[PDB]
Amino acid sequence: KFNGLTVLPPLLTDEMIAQYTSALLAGTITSGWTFGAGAALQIPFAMQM
Amino acid sequence: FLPFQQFGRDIADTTDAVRDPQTLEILDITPCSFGGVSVITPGTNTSNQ
């Protein structure tokens, strides 16, 4: 930004993109394939495999 | 700065520093701040804020 090329910051910061990832991981560990196609349905991961 | 060095440049080959030709002082050159004007307004039929 000192030489005249302005870098605009992204709308999603690093903590929230990482929160999107942790949300998608927590959903795969718990809800599995359900929350992508609908409401999150709790299933144990031992039965998920 | 070394004794024979008048000014100096950064990685962009733009001058980031200059030494006083009269007295002895070393100052960094930072261009003046600028940027774009972003307008936050709702629709014309909502309000004028």
UniProtKB/Swiss-Prot annotation, chain B:
Glycosylation sites noted in the Swiss-Prot or TrEMBL record: 45
Function of the protein: Attaches the virion to the cell membrane by interacting with host receptor, initiating the infection. The major receptor is host ACE2. When S2/S2' has been cleaved, binding to the receptor triggers direct fusion at the cell membrane. When S2/S2' has not been cleaved, binding to the receptor results in internalization of the virus by endocytosis using host TFRC and GRM2 and leading to fusion of the virion membrane with the host endosomal membrane. Alternatively, may use NRP1/NRP2 and integrin as entry receptors.
Complexes and interactors: Binds to host ACE2. RBD also interacts with the N-linked glycan on 'Asn-90' of ACE2. Cleavage of S generates a polybasic C-terminal sequence on S1 that binds to host Neuropilin-1 (NRP1) and Neuropilin-2 (NRP2) receptors. Interacts with host integrin alpha-5/beta-1 (ITGA5:ITGB1) and with ACE2 in complex with integrin alpha-5/beta-1 (ITGA5:ITGB1). May interact via cytoplasmic c-terminus with M protein. May interact (via N-terminus) with host bilirubin and biliverdin, thereby preventing antibody binding to the SARS-CoV-2 spike NTD via an allosteric mechanism.
Protein name (database record): Spike protein S1
Name of encoding gene: S
